[PDB]
Design an enzyme around this catalytic site. Sequence first.
Site, PDB file in Angstrom:
ATOM      1  N   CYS A  88      -1.884 -88.866  44.048  1.00 38.48           N
ATOM      2  CA  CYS A  88      -1.516 -88.607  42.639  1.00 38.48           C
ATOM      3  C   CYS A  88      -0.418 -87.592  42.307  1.00 38.48           C
ATOM      4  O   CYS A  88       0.274 -87.741  41.300  1.00 38.48           O
ATOM      5  CB  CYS A  88      -2.760 -88.233  41.845  1.00 38.48           C
ATOM      6  SG  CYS A  88      -3.803 -89.627  41.452  1.00 38.48           S
ATOM      7  N   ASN A  90      -1.231 -84.531  41.601  1.00 40.13           N
ATOM      8  CA  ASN A  90      -1.916 -83.676  40.643  1.00 40.13           C
ATOM      9  C   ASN A  90      -2.105 -82.234  41.139  1.00 40.13           C
ATOM     10  O   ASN A  90      -2.125 -81.971  42.349  1.00 40.13           O
ATOM     11  CB  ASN A  90      -3.260 -84.305  40.240  1.00 40.13           C
ATOM     12  CG  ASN A  90      -3.090 -85.624  39.480  1.00 40.13           C
ATOM     13  OD1 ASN A  90      -2.014 -85.922  38.952  1.00 40.13           O
ATOM     14  ND2 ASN A  90      -4.154 -86.411  39.416  1.00 40.13           N
ATOM     15  N   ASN A 193      -1.811 -98.574  43.628  1.00 43.59           N
ATOM     16  CA  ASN A 193      -2.262 -98.072  42.337  1.00 43.59           C
ATOM     17  C   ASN A 193      -1.761 -99.003  41.247  1.00 43.59           C
ATOM     18  O   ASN A 193      -0.590 -99.384  41.244  1.00 43.59           O
ATOM     19  CB  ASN A 193      -1.723 -96.671  42.096  1.00 43.59           C
ATOM     20  CG  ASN A 193      -2.042 -95.721  43.229  1.00 43.59           C
ATOM     21  OD1 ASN A 193      -3.179 -95.273  43.378  1.00 43.59           O
ATOM     22  ND2 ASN A 193      -1.035 -95.401  44.036  1.00 43.59           N
ATOM     23  N   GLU A 211      -6.325 -96.239  40.302  1.00 41.50           N
ATOM     24  CA  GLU A 211      -5.872 -95.813  41.630  1.00 41.50           C
ATOM     25  C   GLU A 211      -6.667 -96.459  42.764  1.00 41.50           C
ATOM     26  O   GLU A 211      -7.831 -96.826  42.586  1.00 41.50           O
ATOM     27  CB  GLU A 211      -5.827 -94.281  41.766  1.00 41.50           C
ATOM     28  CG  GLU A 211      -7.074 -93.518  41.334  1.00 41.50           C
ATOM     29  CD  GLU A 211      -7.003 -92.030  41.698  1.00 41.50           C
ATOM     30  OE1 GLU A 211      -6.354 -91.690  42.717  1.00 41.50           O
ATOM     31  OE2 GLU A 211      -7.605 -91.201  40.972  1.00 41.50           O
ATOM     32  N   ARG A 212      -6.019 -96.610  43.918  1.00 46.41           N
ATOM     33  CA  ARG A 212      -6.602 -97.334  45.060  1.00 46.41           C
ATOM     34  C   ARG A 212      -7.859 -96.657  45.631  1.00 46.41           C
ATOM     35  O   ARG A 212      -7.828 -95.473  45.991  1.00 46.41           O
ATOM     36  CB  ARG A 212      -5.544 -97.593  46.152  1.00 46.41           C
ATOM     37  CG  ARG A 212      -4.821 -96.353  46.659  1.00 46.41           C
ATOM     38  CD  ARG A 212      -3.360 -96.646  46.914  1.00 46.41           C
ATOM     39  NE  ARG A 212      -3.068 -97.014  48.299  1.00 46.41           N
ATOM     40  CZ  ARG A 212      -2.256 -96.330  49.104  1.00 46.41           C
ATOM     41  NH1 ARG A 212      -1.647 -95.235  48.670  1.00 46.41           N
ATOM     42  NH2 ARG A 212      -2.042 -96.743  50.345  1.00 46.41           N
ATOM     43  N   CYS A 220      -3.131 -89.753  36.531  1.00 37.95           N
ATOM     44  CA  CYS A 220      -2.400 -89.885  37.767  1.00 37.95           C
ATOM     45  C   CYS A 220      -0.921 -89.540  37.579  1.00 37.95           C
ATOM     46  O   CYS A 220      -0.156 -90.325  37.002  1.00 37.95           O
ATOM     47  CB  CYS A 220      -2.574 -91.299  38.314  1.00 37.95           C
ATOM     48  SG  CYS A 220      -1.828 -91.500  39.916  1.00 37.95           S
ATOM     49  N   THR A 222       1.906 -89.291  39.618  1.00 36.58           N
ATOM     50  CA  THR A 222       2.875 -90.240  40.151  1.00 36.58           C
ATOM     51  C   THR A 222       2.770 -91.628  39.488  1.00 36.58           C
ATOM     52  O   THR A 222       3.782 -92.313  39.287  1.00 36.58           O
ATOM     53  CB  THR A 222       2.758 -90.336  41.695  1.00 36.58           C
ATOM     54  OG1 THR A 222       1.392 -90.568  42.059  1.00 36.58           O
TER      55      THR A 222
END
Length: 283
Positions: A88, A90, A193, A211-212, A220, A222
């Site tokens: 992410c 983050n 994602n 997300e995966r 998220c 990115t």
Amino acid sequence: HMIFAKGHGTQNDFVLLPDVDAELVLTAARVAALCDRRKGLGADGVLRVTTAGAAQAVGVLDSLPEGVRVTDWYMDYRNADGSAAQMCGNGVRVFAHYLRASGLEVRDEFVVGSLAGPRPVTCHHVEAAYADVSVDMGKANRLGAGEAVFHGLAVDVGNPHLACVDSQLTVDGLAALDVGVSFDGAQFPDGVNVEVLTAPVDGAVWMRVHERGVGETRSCGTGTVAAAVAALAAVGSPTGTLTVHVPGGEVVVTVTDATSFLRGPSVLVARGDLADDWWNAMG
């Protein structure tokens, strides 16, 4: 006598532990107890503030990520479940805000190191409790179309994404059940994602991520960058600025030729001490 802070960005909340020399031993059980909302302090993750060289000396880091110097500030990010910084991007805003407000860093422009690589930041305004931070998230690569369920654009922002702009989607329609879907395996052999979003109306967009593996989970970084890229590209713009409305609030993405920037709020709610005895007896 164990310093901590509690902060949050748009949605995610973090416990910060200043530990310049990486003396703290962050066991999975310590992280979990610290993230437990009842038994500890409650957070989505722990951000241990150290330098890349100190992290590599103490075993946290094996070799340095490309572009991260041994002297760089390093965000040692742990998920609540002990695990390490999922893709992410983050934590960086709150981390940077902490660096500035605590006087660990005096400059408004510096680089935050992370497992995924260097993250240059710009601190626009910084107070003890509130900040406005820009993260240089890296080059975003547009890489061809794909279906989901929706038709979107593969965008690579350090990790594979598939952001899907839908002209016929409303803010209300975006309240669809996208927790726990289908994507083309040949296009994304190692998973993806999946972002789903509205058409750019007056420089703004509403989106949700899946997300995966982790399922529909919070915000998220990115993925927000991937969403804005795909929205700009749908309006015929390889570069520009979009406000992106995400669960919890809004952020602003800027895409240039060279890179992409994510800009949003950061809040530091509290500062203080964890009880040393408590820290010890937590696994």
